[PDB]
Amino acid sequence: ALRFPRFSQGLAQDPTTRRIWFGIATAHDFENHDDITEERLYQNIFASHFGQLAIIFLWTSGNLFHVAWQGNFEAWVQDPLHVRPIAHAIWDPHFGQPAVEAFTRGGALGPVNIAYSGVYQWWYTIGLRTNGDLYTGALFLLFLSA
């Protein structure tokens, strides 16, 4: 009640390190927290659902923004079969010169990663042909997460 596991006094009384280890482990078991009722459990579940939706929308928006900013969508749409899609750029202080020269692929001017997710084809099929569309979609998804 006074230590880190505020939802469980029994786990907060012991002096060993397991109090930390179990504290992370039982944070989502709402039926184990002391002084619990049905109303509180249902409301916490509802709030967790909302948070999960926000996280999903933020993830999709980030993917769209990175593809727009550091990708080659406009070069890929013209020749789909002879262009390798790009996911995001690579910045690494540990890279040597051979790694920098060898990781440059596609039309990029620096090291990049090839996207095996398959979102280029999905976005091309539904009717996106420019970077502005991707930017608008990212903005809309950020608004939805908020």
Partner: protein, 742 residues
Amino acid sequence: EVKILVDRDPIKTSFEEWAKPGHFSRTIAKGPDTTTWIWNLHADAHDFDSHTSDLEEISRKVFSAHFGQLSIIFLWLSGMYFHGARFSNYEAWLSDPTHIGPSAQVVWSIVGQEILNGDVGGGFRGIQITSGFFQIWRASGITSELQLYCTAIGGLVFAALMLFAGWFHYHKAAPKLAWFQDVESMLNHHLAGLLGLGSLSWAGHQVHVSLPINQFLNAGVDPKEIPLPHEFILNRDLLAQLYPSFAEGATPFFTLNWSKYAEFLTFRGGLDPVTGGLWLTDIAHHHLAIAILFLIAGHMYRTNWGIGHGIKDILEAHKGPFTGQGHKGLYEILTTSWHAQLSINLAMLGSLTIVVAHHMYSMPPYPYLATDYGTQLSLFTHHMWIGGFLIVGAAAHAAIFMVRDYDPTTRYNDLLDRVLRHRDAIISHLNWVCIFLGFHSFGLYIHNDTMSALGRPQDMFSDTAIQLQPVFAQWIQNTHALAPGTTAPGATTSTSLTWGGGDLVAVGGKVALLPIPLGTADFLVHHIHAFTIHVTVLILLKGVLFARSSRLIPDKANLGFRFPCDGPGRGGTCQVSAWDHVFLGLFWMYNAISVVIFHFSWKMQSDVWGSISDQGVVTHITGGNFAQSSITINGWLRDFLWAQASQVIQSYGSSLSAYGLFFLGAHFVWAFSLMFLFSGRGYWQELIESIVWAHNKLKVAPATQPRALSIVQGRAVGVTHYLLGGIATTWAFFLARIIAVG
């Protein structure tokens, strides 16, 4: 005093005890209530210390078991000799040893397994053997099969004699307790009689039989034209023509002008150019000297007469700076319990086996042995594994003694108490050493891998970027190379060709031996070896020291030696017994031995073994890629595991196909072991409950109610399957590679 004391007919031979199983223990003898009884009947069969408490019966049982083991060993030797005599190509291999592969087994023609009869050579088809028996027989002077048949018959006779002796000494005349407790006479007889006399007789055989026949063979004489061994003894003219010193007879030996025997007793050293092995004269000289040394050393302890030494007096009268009174009550402890002696002998035998493997690979003592690569590899790996297993067993028996035979009231020792009073510091220091060694040794490899993966080959720990050279080993190598010039004037050349410096020795177009270079890779692998050995030592020592009691459990000695746990309390007390410590150290012994054998195999294939053309260039099997590819884990995985496994997986449809099958089968067994190491008993018991219900519905319920295995039994099964699978995988891979490529 020293005397022969026996008891007449202590036991009566009858079959009444054969009918009832488990007669040794009353609990087992009562009868089977569940299936677990069966699993117990084999576990307590050889625990003589638990059947009774009198030392006399235990000693008699031990003596009889030793006799039975000797009989079994003699039977095995006789079988090997008979196979060599009947189904083998020894006579064909004798004439052309370089171009013929030894074989001593023939497979039947029932199913289609006749493809296993490969074309070994010499007009024969069979399985190529790697036991190295042909070289032993050649070095002994055997040139026919009748002698092998006679040896097999003699082995059979000796096995029968050993079995009869065991029966006689258990059921007719059994020695008393005072007979076994006489260690001075036993030591005198084992030193002077068993070792000195045997080596002296073998030296005599080598002088009289092996040397002339081997000289005739090395000259180029056909094996069918060599005179029989007894002709040399009967005809002194032949020996005079061979060695003129024999013309003088035994007069020089008593005349002390021993130089006349310099013809067949030499001190040259090195390898014989014709056969690629040690000189037989040097071997005979060494055996003679060893016989003299053992015969002299066998008269040290006082038995039945005034002259001699007392072991108890030597131990008690010992005074030193760090020791003090020290060894006061060790004699009673060593002469009271069998387990301490068993542990000491097991550790010594394991160390001796490892030393034997090293000395045997370094200096080949048999003719045409260095140029046969499979035999060398098999001998090295086998002896290393045996030594590791013995070293592991020593700690288990030490823990058994400390658990069940230690009492500080009647038999008290100061050194053991002093060691037991500060175990925490020892354990902490060993833990720190293990952590430090592991961190450095593995971090070097991980750093090399990361630097190579980032396109930075100039930042690695290699011979080109950052050099870590074994300076001390190189200094020792140079000293050994320069040894015979000034330090050892008697020897013409150095003991071994391994030392950096000298010439190359090759026999029949194949390299026999050449100096071995040392670099950064050897440094890293040696440190890895040290780390693994230290971790195994830490595990075994922690198991041995904390057997009686611990801070967590203050009364661990009451529970015994083989108990699963104490309970779910105290946070959990699983695997607290010393048996669990041994079961855990088995894994680390396996790991260490696997790493050692991998290092030896790759280094020997890369830097020593190979072929020589007429011009004088040497081409190695893997072309010397050890020094640049073994500094990273990816190199070990690609240039050793991936590259050298081509032969084993492509052996289907050929005479090596069996090996390939094993390369799969062992794998399966390994995975099977996991089932016994990741689960628990309750799930299996609850499943057997439903299975038993399904049986009960159809009136097929057995009286012996099925029960799941105990925890200790499950752990033992898991570790046994793991070890067997891993060892069989390594065996199949090594044999397939070294037979297909060498």
